Each structure stands twice: as C-alpha cells, then as structure tokens.
C-alpha cells in the first residue's frame, strides 16, 4: 500500500494518477494556481520518472526534452523542491540506490563539492591496501598471477600504516577501510592495525576472501575483534563454484569452516563486531539465490542464535564478459530477487539485503548496466578529494583496481608515495595544488571499480551542468 | 488513510485503533504468542504515546509506569524495535521536533556517544561570535549594558578567527556558523571572515539583526554574499513593536529597508544566498503571524520574484493558539507558498493541542563538563565559552565557562582536546543556568537521559530511540 | 478492529482504508500503487450497506462514480476482505442482515417469490379469533366487525385442515396470532394440540386478557404450545385503558400471567413466556418498570422465569440511555431475560440516524410474497399481508388470494394465485396492510428485483449466501 | 467474560466460578450462602459439555455427586446463565453443537429419528458415477468393481424423479457426491440442471480428475452448480501417487483446475469452488503449502479466487488413516501458522475444521468418535440421512453404498423404482420397524456425519430413558 506520486517512476506505473495526486498537492499548497496545477504537475512528474531512472541525465537534455524555456525550467526545479513525494520517487525509483548510497550521502557531506573546485581537502574515503600476497586467482580480479610485495617490506609497510591512520580525523568512523588490491590476511600485522585505528578513534571494516581466517589467526591478529565488521568476499556455494571462480580445490570447505569457527567463537566472546558477505552474482548462478540463504542459515546455526548481519549482491563492475551476465540471464533476476527475499524472511529474518546498482534497478522489472566509463569520460585528475588508496610501499593510487603490484599502467595513477618525511595529507594537497594530470589511454579505465565510475559520472554530470548555467541545480538532486 | 498506530500520540487518539494494529503486527510476524499480544501492544503503545510527548523520559521511569519488571521492560525494548509505525508515532508525535530536528541526527553522527563518553573530539557545532559591538538592548538579551570589546582586539582576533577556520574538518560544510553574544555585522572584517570560510569549503549562515546590513556594509564586506544564508533576528512588525524589544528609534524602518534593498540586489546578482527570519509570538498576539506573512510579502515584491525561503517562530489560550498557527498557515499558502516554517520544540507540540511541557535545565541538573564534543563557542579575544549565552564580555559569572583561549600557540583544537583530556570540570553556582540556550538546553537533557539510563543498567538501549552511523560497503 | 467498525457514525474512516489496504496490497489482489483508491471504495461501500441495506447494486455504483466493469472488480474484491463484511454485518443496520436477510436467503425463502414459482408459504400465520374485547387505538380493526359466531366449527375444521398442509423441516413454520383476539376461539386449545402431534412447535400471540384459569381448563391444549407472548398495552390499569378501551385491563392481564406462572411451574411445563412492550417518545424510562413487572412475574413461578422480551418502537440520547439502564438492571433482576430490539430501536442504539420502512403503493409489489408468508382466518381467507386479515377492513378484501375449503387447500390456493399471474394494483392506504415483516419482505424483494433486472443477478442484494459443506 | 471460554485449556476456572457466582446472587437466583457451591456445578456442566457434547445426563449428574432434585435444579438454573451456554457453543466441541447438533434439533430432524416417525430424508446423496479410477488407501472401495456401464440410462431417468421428491425449504438437501467418482457419469450435467430447475443449489464433491474442458463441454449443466468441491490428496505428484496410487494425478488436477479458473473468469459464472483437504500420517507440516497451492489457483482466475477449505481427517480411526499421537500434538501450532497464513495472502479463503481438528486450536486434545457395532442404532437414521447410487438402491449409511463391498447390502432399505419411490422406500422401513443387526465390520460403513448422528440419538435416547425427556441432550433449544 505506497502513495500513487511515490511509485511513479517504477515500470508499469500509473502516471496518470501521480500527476492528479501531483496537481492537488501543488493546488492545496497554493504554489501553483489552480488553472495550471495540471499542465506543472506533469512536468514536475516527467522529471522523476527520468531521475528516477537515469541519475546521471544533464539538465539541459531534462529541458530539451519537456521542450519548456529556462526560465520555466527553474521553476520547475524550484516548484520541484516543494513536493516531497516526487523526491521520494526519485531516491527510491529503480535508480534509488544510486541516489541513497552514493550520490545524495557524498553530495551532503560536500565531498563532491571540494573534487569540483578542484580544492586540497582529505580523502574522505581512504583504503589501505595491507595484503603482501593472495591464494586465489579469481577471474574477474585485476591482479597478475605470481606477482607480491617482498615480505621484508612489512615492518616498515605496517609503520608506515600507522602514521596514515594517526592523519585519519575523526568524526567519520568509516572514513578508513582495510581492503585491498591482495588479501589483507596475509599481513601478519593486520590486527595490529585494526587496533592502532580502534584506538585513534575509527571503526573500520575488513573486506577479506577469509581463506586465513583461521583460529589461529585469530589468535595471533586479537585486533581484529576490534574491527567495525568483517566482510567476506563469497565466490560460491560448494567446492567446485569455488573452483571455477577462484581456481583453487577445496577452497569453498576452509572458507566455511573458518566462518563457522568464527561465528562460535562470536557468541562465546559477545564481540559486537558484525559479520556481512559481498556475493557477486557470477554468469550461470542466477539461480542460485536460493542457496544463498541456506548457506547463511546454516552459518547462523554455529552463531547460537547470534545472526550474519547483512549481505551485499553485486555485480562485475569491469563488463568484461567473464562477469557479465547475459541478458537472458538479468531477465531472470527480478523473479530470482523477488524469491530470494522471500526466502531470507522465512529463513534469516534479521539478515540486512542491499542490491548493486543494476541489480536494484531489475528489481520491479527496469532493466539497467552498471556504467563502463571508457578513456574519453574519465577526468584527468582523478577524484583524491573522494577516495585514495595505499599500499605496503606507501604508494598512494588514484583508483581502486589500480593498486595492485606488477600491473601494466597502474605506476601512473600514483598520486605520490607516503614516506617519513611526506605524510598522505602532503601528497594528497601537492598532487592537487599542482593541478597534477593523468592522460587516459586505452585499458585504464579498468583500474576503476564501480565506485570510481559512479564518482566519475556524477562529476561529470556535476561539471556539465555547472557549465550549462545550472551551477546551483547542478545534479538535479543534492542538498 | 493514515495508520492509528503512527499517530497515537497526538491528543484525542484513538488508542484502541492503535493496539489493534500492533497486536496484528505482532501477531503476523510471530514475534509473541496471540494469547499475550494485547497486553504486549497496550505497553508498547503506551510507550510511543509516552516518548511521543516526553522524549527525555529515563528508560526506568517508562518501566515504572508500564508496571513491569525489568525483564518484561528489556523484551518490550526489542520488540519495539520491530513495530515500525510505533517509531512513526514517536518521531512524529507532539515532541517529534526533538526527535527528526535534533535528538536522532546527532545520535546518528555520534555527537552524542563521543559525549557521553567524554571523547577528546572536535566539536560538532562550532559559533564563531566576531562582533565588538551591538546597537540594539533587547530586554531579553544577556548582554550587558556599557560592555563591549576594545578596537583593539579586531586585528588579531579576526586573524584568529581564520586560524580556527582552517581547523574544521571536512566532512560537514555546516559544522561553523556566525552569530553572537553581540552583533556580527559591526565587525568590518566579517565578509572577509565569510569569504575565507567559502573557500575552506564551508557554507555558513549568519545571524544577526541586520541593523548595519546596509548597503554601504555590503561594499565593504562583499564577501557576505558568498554566505550559505542570512537569518535575521525580527523584532516586530512596526517601528513602536521594534523600540520596546530593542529600545532603538525606527530600528523597523532600517531593518525592512535593508532587507527590501537585499532584495533587489539578491535578485539582480541572482545570488544563491538564502534568507529567512526568525519570529518570536509574545502572549497573547499571535494574531501577529498573520503580519509576518504580510511583512514576508511585502518583501518578495523586492525580490521580482525571488522570494524569502524560512523562517522560524519560536514562543515566549490552548485551543486559541492551536487556531492562530492554522490561520497562520493558510495565510502563507495563500500569500507566501513556498515559505518553509519550522517552530520551536514546544510550539511544535501545541500544533495539535498537546501540553507544552516545559525545558527548565537547573544549576543541580547541569552537566559540570558542559559538552564541548556537541558545541563550543569562540569570541573576538579567542576565549571559547562553553554555552551559547556566556560569551558576552563582562557577563557576570560568565569567564567561569571558559575552556580555554585560542592563541597563535594554542589552537581551538588544542583547547577542547586538553579540556576534555583533563577532566575539566565547571561546578555550577545560581545563575549559571541561563548561559544556555535552546539547544544547549536539550544536549544537556538528552546527556543527562543517556547517562541516568547507562547507570541503570540499560547502556544498550539509553535515549529509548537512536540512530546508528549508517555503513554501507560498495 | 477500525475496519470492523466503519459503517457505525463518527467511526475513523481514515483509519478503514489503511486496514483494508493493507489486506489487499498483501494479498496481491490489487498492485500496491491503487491499493489506497480500491480501499476508499470498499469502505464506501461497507459503509452504505451498514447503514441502508437495501441500496440497489446500480445507486450504489453511482455513487461510487465507476463504470460497469469497474464495480465487478469492487464487488469480487469486496468479498476478499473479511472485515468489511463484518463491518456490515454489525453495522447501525446489521440486524437486518442477521436476523432476517441472511437467514432467509439461505432457506432460499426469496428465491421462490423472485422466480414467480408455486411453493408453500416459508411462514404461515392463523388467526382463528372470530372477535376482540380490546378496542386498541393504534390498531386497525374496524370497531362493530366481527366473525359470524357459526363460523367457527367449520372453520377450525379448516384450520385443522391447514395445519395437516404443513411440511417438515420448520417446526415454527406456523404461528396462532390474529387480526383480532386468538384466545376467543373456543377451540384454539384443540388447534394448538392438532399442530403439536403434526410436530409443530407453534407461538401464540394474544393480549392474555382471556387467559384465565378457566380458558386454561377449555382448553388445555394450550398448554402443549411453544411459547405465549403477550401484547403488553401498558403497566398500570390507567396506562392500559388509555391504550385498549377497557377497564381493569391490567389488573386482568397480571392476575391471568401471575396465576399462569404458578400452574407452569406445578405443571414443569417447557412453555416459554414473552412479551412485547412498545416504548413510547420519551417515556423510554418505563423500560425500567418493565423490568419490575417481569421480576413480579418471576416471583410467582418459583424459579421459572419469563423468558423474553420483545421491545420495539412507536434528539434522541434520552433513548439511547434509557435502554443502557434497562440492559443493567436487566442483569441484576433478571438476568436470564432474552432482550430482542426492532430494527429502528436496534440502530437508535450505536446513535445511528435511522428510521424504519415506510413502503408506499408505488413501491409495492403487485404480486406480494405468497411464497413468503400468507394468513388465514376463520372463513379460510388468505390474505396477503400480516395487516388486512380483519373482517370489514376498508380496501382489504382485494388482498385475499383465495379461500381454504374442504375443496380446495392453502397449497392449491397459493399455487393457482402464483401460476396465473394475479396482482393487486396498490391504492392509498394500502399500504397500512403491511406489518414490519412485510415492509422488509417488499424492500429485498425490490432490491433483488432491480439488482437482477440491472444484470447483477449474481450480486443481488450486495450479500446473500455463506458456504455450507460441514455433512459433506 | 471469564466465564465465555470456560470451557477451553488454561482458562481461570476460579475467576469463572466468581463471575456465575455474582450472576447467581445479583439475580437472585440462589441464595447468596450457596452461590459459590452452585455456580462451581454449573460451570463444571459448561465446562464437561463444553468438550465433550454426548455426555449422558447421568453420567454428569453422578460426576457432580448430587441428586435427580438438585440436578433438576442445577439444569433449570443453568439455562439463566446465558455464558455459560457460550462457553458450552464456543468451547473445544463447539463444532458438534453449531455445526450439526442444535441446527438439526432446530429443524426438528432428530425428533422426527427418535420419534420412529416416516419423514423425508433431510440429507439425500446421489451416488450416480460408475466407477473411479483413483485408489485412495482411505478408502473402502473395492479396487476394480464397477457399475455396469448399462445402468447408466436408466439411473439417470431414476435419479430425476428421486429429485423431483425433494421438498422445498432446504435448497441444499441434495447432494452429488458418492461411494465413486460423480463425474464418471457422462448425464451427471443433467442432472445438475434438472435439480437447478427444481430450485435446489446442489454441490458436486469430485476428484475433479474428470473435471476437463471437454466434459465441461459435454455437460453444460456442471456450471449451474452452487458449488464443485474437489477432494485435494496432495500437494505434488509424489504425495498424489503415495494416497491415490496413480502417477501424474496431482498434475492432471492441478492442470484442470487451472484451466477451470480460466472458464469461470470468462463467463463469469456464480460457481463456488471449493476443496476438501485430509491432514494425513506424516503431512501435518504441510499446511503453510496448501496456502501456496490456493494461490496458484487465484494467479489462473484473474481475480476470481477460491472460495473454501475444509480442513478434515480420516474420520474411519484406522491405521493408515490416523495421525500418531506425536503429530497430532503438532497441530495446534501448525494451524495457527495456517490462518495467519491465509489472512496474508488468500484473505478472501473461507477455513472450517472438522470436529476434532477444531479441538486441535486451543490445545484441547480430541479425537473423533469410533462407532462399534455395540453403540450402532440397528434402525440406522433414514429421516437424516439417505444415499441412492445408480441401481436405485438406498444405502443406509454414506459408505456403504459401494459395488461389491462384502456385507454392505445388507444395509439396503429398498431400491427406487418406476414402481417405488424414495419417500415410499423410508416410509416403508420405518413404518414397518426395519432393522439390521450389526457385525463385526458393519461400523466402517459409517462416515464422520453417520457417526455423530448415532452418537447424538444414542445420547438422547438414553437421557429420555433415564427419566430426562424434556431436558434431553443438555442443549437443545
Ligand atoms: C579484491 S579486494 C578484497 C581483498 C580480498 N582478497 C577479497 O577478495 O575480499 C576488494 C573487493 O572487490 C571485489 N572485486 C574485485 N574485482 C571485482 C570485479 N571485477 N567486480 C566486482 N567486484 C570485484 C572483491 O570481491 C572484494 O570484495
Ligand atoms: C467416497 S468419496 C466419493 C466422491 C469423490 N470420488 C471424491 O473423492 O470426492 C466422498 C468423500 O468422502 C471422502 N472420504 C472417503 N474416505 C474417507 C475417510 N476415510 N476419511 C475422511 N474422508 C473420506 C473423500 O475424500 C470424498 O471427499
Ligand atoms: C544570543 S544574543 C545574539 C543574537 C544575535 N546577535 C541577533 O540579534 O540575531
Ligand atoms: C395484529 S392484531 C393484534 C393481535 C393480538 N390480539 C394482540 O393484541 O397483539
Ligand atoms: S578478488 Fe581478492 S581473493 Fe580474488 S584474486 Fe583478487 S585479491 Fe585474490
Ligand atoms: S539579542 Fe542580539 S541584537 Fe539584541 S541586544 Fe542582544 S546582541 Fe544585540
Ligand atoms: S391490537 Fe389486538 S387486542 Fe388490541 S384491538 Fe387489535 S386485535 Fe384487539
Ligand atoms: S475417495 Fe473418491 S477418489 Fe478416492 S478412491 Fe474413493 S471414490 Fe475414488
Ligand atoms: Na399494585
């Protein structure tokens, strides 16, 4: 039972009964007379119906195609302010995750503003990279086979660590994360640096395989009981998924039993650390879904009672085709989606569910890609006002998926190296003082995740619109 | 087609139709037995009505007027957690204001726990009062008479003043405004104070009397356009109303004046900059408000369509008022549409006839280490007053709230963090109550809940309602 | 339950359509998105049927301002929320639905007079009293008319005869009431002792005027009948005469009950004993001296209690009241009293706004409701209406759709009356030969009348049927 | 009111005691030094009758320890607590007493059977199909006997004069169900028509295996039934083949059941559909999906829903049939789980429960009866209930009216000829006194319906004999 106005970018809709529940509301409100609440309020619903739909639309085509003069464009975008439920469809219309995840909670802390003035400000989103090495060779990873940071580079790796942690300031407990380009496990010192961060202040979050998540490790790392959470990147059900994805035997049986383990071991501790999982769906496992519960279900057994919080589904964010998934495949997914919530409500009721992009678009049935942003859209400086990363040799990258050692270009989106004598705030404000550049060539734009697209398009959207004469509208949505 | 159960705080709810909806949402999630699903949503009803009207009731006195033992109370916390129209009704009950304005977003940016914690942490809320001196003497205001800054504290303090800017994080381009114990605008370096925090990437808003808001003041101080917005202070609707707050001559004339030649140049300049108007209704004339929108009018015609965009009416005969807040509505509908109005936290609640229950923080109810995690407020000599309403030179009592001076060796960073390291401690004496102000008022009342509910054992659930910070992995 | 209670005044009807939209959006019956309009219409509905349940289907649509189409979809949805049947059910209106609608519907009563079809008479009233020693003034029996007295032998032979007629399957298919005065038939006591062995459990309805211990002795038959309701005309002898014309009436009518109380209880006799009082405007207090006229009563049967009333009527909060404190002091005197309301005083009751009936000659149905309910007196008359069965009525002979004989049965004269078509064309004051059974009778009948005509044969009369299979 | 539900598991008889006990004095009914001794009988009345509904008066009064004057007493003073008649009504055996016992007694049917007195059957079944294909271990078919496929003409013109006895006053006292399959009966449409233009709304209990497009072709008259109930064994092919014995059964059903949603949208037709559903050893978990199986059906109606569920059992109390002690405790719980269930997501889904199973809620262990042969009527009860199948026969009791089961003719009271009517066959067998002795087997020719009957006219029968006549059967009304 959802309001007409508020549902109305979703496929099927009934547009007609928004612009009726639109034009009394502009009428009742006296924003708009009420001769023309009609003629408005099916402007105003046009507008949500595409941003609900298209986050990333620049004004001027929003103009072009309501074929209406800019003076009444900015009346129309100021009329639009003034009912909430079409705000409502847009940040919950097949786009919404778009919105309420990324763009509306980075344009209101300003991030985006300081990457658009192209000011010196500090990352608002640091990743440390503290993995030496990694045992998969999961197929959809940027990383080269073989390739590894020297393992006599740790102590001064893990040093160096600390004193990025110590420039991290506080008031955002997850303005630093321990993932990686490798696996942050094999950092002996991990939980050293999960406690030298609990105790400035942060609660970060691990993104880890969990293959060395053993009792022994817990052992040795006691700081990982620190941490915020601890995200295992699942890469299938059984043995032989786990084989196909990441290459290796008997992957799938360590990996569970070391969830197992550690979800006994988070009862009898009563650690308020919480446990989620990130669960591409891979080409062929659509209908997998279901099975997807009974393994949480099964892991929430050896919890007593103390349940696996949440879990991202997520697509390759690179669209190569040993990620995508066909068409035929997506057009599953809605009823595949629709029965997987159903089953974690029956089985796992407290387990929180949140959708990739795409996947939350597909969902009441609009069909959407991810963004595959090519060398011609991407900006030249990067974006370090929003995200950074560092790896064990102090290497600050300007993508995610470009801070892996030993891969062909990656050198080049190296923002500066964090020394004792050069702290991450010092690269960070050099780079962009400078107005440092890095020229896009073909097969760059792989060393950007789905973040750094989403980051890029918004900025691009944000710097066309600006350009456009719409500064202060720019993005349709922000503060 | 509202659901009873998100309203059951208001007066005259049917609360009959709201434990029927509960029992239903209790019983199809099967989180109770149907045998006890009416005694259980009689209870937790009966506290959404309770926390929809009085948000600082400690968890303990809740559980003495349900009548349950302490381990009925903890089931019925969890189960509150699971009836969302319950939460509706108390975040949107007749002390919803505390909830959705202030209480729950500072619970979910961990204002609060770095508080109640007694964390060495940058403030929230950082008040940057810059002006030397006021014009006006409005009986209300704390300010002493014959008491001002010297010339010779603008130099440096208003080098000070940057030196803090630069000490803001990013992350909130709201975390600094400019207001005052005196008047902003007398400061003439106040515009270059606006344009230095502009391009730290800050969007401040000032509030002052717009008295000097000439347009010989815009000339000298241009940075004040660059300002996020300007709330002026409006002390009457005529110039007779005008003298007996402020004891000033035509002050009305001046201020509308100002504001009508803002206006135009807002307008010519198309400026983002927004403009609202904070409104106090005095006993018994809140037949006024029907003036404000009429005044609010009046300078929109300035503006060529570009309009005022809030203001805020704050108190200080039931069912009379009730009526007087309709009228006041359908007048701006009528003649101000798109005008955004916000009121206080009580005359929020008298909005629905609920009974205005009143904030009165006194000496044995203040917290000795104020909370300087929340707020701090810094003057032109870069003293940091604890409270709003103490920095006013020669405030009798007042230097008692000092954490610290902001000096080229000490920064304000360095005075919170050391006043907080040290347990710094102010003992409070008769009087030092009304160096508060509204908001100072309910952080302290919401820290005194939290940690009387810690201490009875409920440090879980303290404050009945919170939000957490919101974790989302990509 | 909100949308339990909707169609009651001043019920939260905002409160309604987010209950019933609830129910439809979970269901899948109706996409989340419409699930509040679909709501609003269902409430609408439930709340014109609760209050006026003989809306026709098309008026009710109209309202609504739907097409066709759109009102079968309301109408199958309708039956998908359980709540708003209820909320009809127990609406200002419900009794009409519980305790006559309903219940007829599923003997399939109506049927037979909506298909124009020969059946016999779902309810079959005698009125064997050839006169009446009351002279009421709110009846409409013709003062100086009465029953020539060699009418009666022959004509209790033909009663008698009726009664054989009687199928199985309703043992209170058959009633002694009257135009005029049942107890003045020397053999009433026969006639009640005749059904009893066809096994018939009949009511007697009468003043008790006559109900003497010497009548009992006459006719002991009497005492094998069901139940005796009396009409009870006032509470004191004032009262009385004003309503019947006669002198020490009550002393009389008290005397014969209290002595009847006595010789129940001696006998150990199953008859059950009622009354219907009407209260009059503003004079509703009365109620609580009905009540200590019944306790009296009680007082006399050692034990044995009257068992029930029959209270029906002639701002309005007086009223409202008034039967709260007779419902209380009901239970602390006596509290195993059956308490029965009209349909008017059953809505006055919730502080509903409603009257009763008021069915005109143009809305009369030429046909009647033989099907229905019939009447026969002394002459073997079969009238058509509960009200025209009195000798010399003006107009009222034109209702009689043919005479019981040793030639000719109440099935043969109901059958040919069917058959052949035969109709009565409604004159002013006609009307008034209608009791409030036959009011509520011609107003279904119109309503499922125009609701099948209008092509909603399946829908007709909004609610009807339940579904039955517990024998399997 | 604590003294409404009395009578169900875990209610304060203590505060129930009270409450009659106020009754008792306020009223003045009893003198109030006694009220609280009285009221404890009273509610122990309410409270046994409330469970178990046969009770001989006798047997109550000598669990009160009281005697025939107090007794006496005791009864009339009941009738003047109207809660606890409730709390009798609504108790755990409330079915027995508004489903079949106090309607019947209002219609005078009972008294017409204790009477001896000729009067026409309330209850006719017609048994007119041939044969079935299905082998339901639950029942008492023999596997392969059939009705000769020649009798079909001249059972089709018998059963439209046996419908042409019925009387008027109960549109539903006929019946199309059967010892076999009804619509194995190429006229069975027919025959639907011809009591439809009788005035009756007649309903069909099938295995709707035969229920397809072509018969409901072939046999327009199908669709002017009040009602086609189809007997659900199961809720997939497997569950089907381990009840019936026959493999893609479940998908055959399903599949015609589907595709009859879509013809009754079509045409709109006033038809209710409902289903019969036997919890069986081994299926009491299965409940949440027949919700799901419901709902499949709505899906194929577009918006014309299914219109009722009878939850029942084996009502035979044989092994095969019965549910072990431990799954029967499980089904409290799992039919709460059901409604709400069904208030979710078939809101419009009418649900009874049969006599037992409505015990089942509210925790009130109950079983259904098991008539011997030394608790049989030997004049059975033909003014309840009579069944004919397609040579005419008048079966005495509803399963015994197969082909070829061992001794079940001798339960014939006559065969409906051009000659002999049905009502000339009951009048005949009362009038005269016909009775059959019962053996040992005689009781498995009794359905759930003929055994409560009994067990109500035995009930009442002996309380008349022991001196109670008038107050027969506690409630009666
Ligand atoms: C690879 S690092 C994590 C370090 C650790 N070895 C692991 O796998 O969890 C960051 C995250 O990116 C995800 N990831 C890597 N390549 C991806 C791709 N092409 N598409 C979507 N997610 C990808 C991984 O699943 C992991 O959760
Ligand atoms: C004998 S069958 C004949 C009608 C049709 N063949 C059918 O299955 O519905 C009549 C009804 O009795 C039911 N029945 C047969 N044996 C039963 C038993 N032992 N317990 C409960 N019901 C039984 C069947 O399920 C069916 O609904
Ligand atoms: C708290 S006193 C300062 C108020 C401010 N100077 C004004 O007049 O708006
Ligand atoms: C409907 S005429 C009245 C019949 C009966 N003699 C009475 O007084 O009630
Ligand atoms: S995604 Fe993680 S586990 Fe897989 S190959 Fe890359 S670094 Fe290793
Ligand atoms: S309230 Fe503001 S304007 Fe008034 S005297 Fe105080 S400082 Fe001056
Ligand atoms: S109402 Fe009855 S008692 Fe009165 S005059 Fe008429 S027939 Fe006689
Ligand atoms: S119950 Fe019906 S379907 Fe099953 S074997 Fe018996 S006759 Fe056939
Ligand atoms: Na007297």
Same mark, same amino acid.
């Given at each position: 039972?959802? *309001?007409? %106005?508020?549902?109305?970018?979703? +496929?099927?809709?009934?547009?007609?009964?928004?612009?009726?529940?639109?034009?009394?509301?502009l009428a009742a409100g006296g924003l708009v007379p009420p001769d023309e609440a009609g003629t408005t309020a099916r402007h105003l619903v046009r507008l949500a119906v595409r941003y609900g739909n298209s986050p990333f639309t620049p004004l001027e085509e929003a103009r072009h195609d309501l074929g209406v003069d800019r003076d009444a464009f900015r009346r129309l975008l100021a009329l639009f302010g003034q009912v909430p439920e079409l705000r409502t469809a847009v940040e919950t219309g097949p786009a919404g995750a778009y919105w309420k995840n990324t763009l509306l909670p980075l344009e209101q802390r300003g991030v985006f503003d300081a *990457?658009? %003035?192209?000011?010196?400000?500090? +990352?608002?989103?640091?990743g440390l990279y503290p993995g030496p090495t990694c045992m998969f060779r999961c197929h959809f990873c940027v990383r080269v086979t073989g390739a590894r940071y020297d393992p006599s580079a740790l102590d001064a790796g893990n040093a160096m660590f600390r004193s990025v942690i110590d420039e991290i300031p506080a008031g955002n407990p997850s303005a630093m994360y321990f993932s990686g380009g490798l696996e942050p496990l094999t950092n002996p010192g991990l939980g050293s640096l999960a406690a030298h961060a609990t105790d400035h202040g942060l609660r970060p979050t691990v993104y880890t395989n969990s293959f060395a998540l053993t009792e022994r490790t817990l052992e040795r790392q006691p700081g990982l009981w620190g941490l915020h %959470?601890?995200?295992?990147?699942?890469?299938?059900?059984?043995?032989?998924?786990?084989?196909?994805?990441?290459?290796?035997?008997?992957?799938?049986?360590?990996?569970?039993?070391?969830?197992?383990?550690?979800?006994?071991?988070?009862?009898?501790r009563e650690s308020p650390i919480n446990l989620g999982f990130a669960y591409i769906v891979?080409?062929?496992?659509?209908?997998?879904?279901?099975?997807?519960?009974?393994?949480?279900?099964?892991?929430?057994?050896?919890?007593?009672?103390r349940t696996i919080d949440f879990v991202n589904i997520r697509e390759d964010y690179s669209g190569r085709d040993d990620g995508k998934l066909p068409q035929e495949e997506r057009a599953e997914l809605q009823e595949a989606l629709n029965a997987f919530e159903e089953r974690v409500r029956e089985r796992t009721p407290g387990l929180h569910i949140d959708y990739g992009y795409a996947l939350n678009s597909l969902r009441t049935g609009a069909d959407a890609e991810l963004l595959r942003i090519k060398p011609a859209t991407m900006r030249p400086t990067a974006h370090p006002q929003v995200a950074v990363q560092v790896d064990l040799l102090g290497?600050?990258?300007?993508?995610?998926?470009?801070?892996?050692?030993?891969?062909?270009?990656?050198?080049?989106?190296?923002?500066?190296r964090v020394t004792p004598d050069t702290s991450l705030t010092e690269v960070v404000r050099d780079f962009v003082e400078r107005g440092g550049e890095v020229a896009a060539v073909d097969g760059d734009e792989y060393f950007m995740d789905g973040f750094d697209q989403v980051v890029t398009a918004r900025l691009n959207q944000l710097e066309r619109d600006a350009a456009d004469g719409w500064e202060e509208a720019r993005g349709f949505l922000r503060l």
């Open positions: 039972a959802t *309001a007409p %106005a508020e549902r109305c970018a979703h +496929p099927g809709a009934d547009l007609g009964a928004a612009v009726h529940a639109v034009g009394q509301t *990457a658009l %003035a192209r000011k010196p400000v500090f +990352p608002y989103s640091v %959470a601890i995200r295992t990147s699942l890469y299938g059900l059984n043995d032989e998924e786990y084989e196909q994805t990441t290459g290796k035997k008997a992957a799938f049986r360590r990996v569970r039993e070391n969830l197992r383990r550690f979800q006994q071991l988070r009862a009898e891979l080409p062929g496992r659509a209908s997998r879904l279901l099975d997807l519960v009974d393994f949480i279900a099964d892991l929430n057994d050896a919890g007593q009672g290497d600050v990258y300007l993508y995610r998926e470009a801070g892996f050692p030993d891969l062909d270009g990656a050198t080049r989106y190296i923002a500066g």
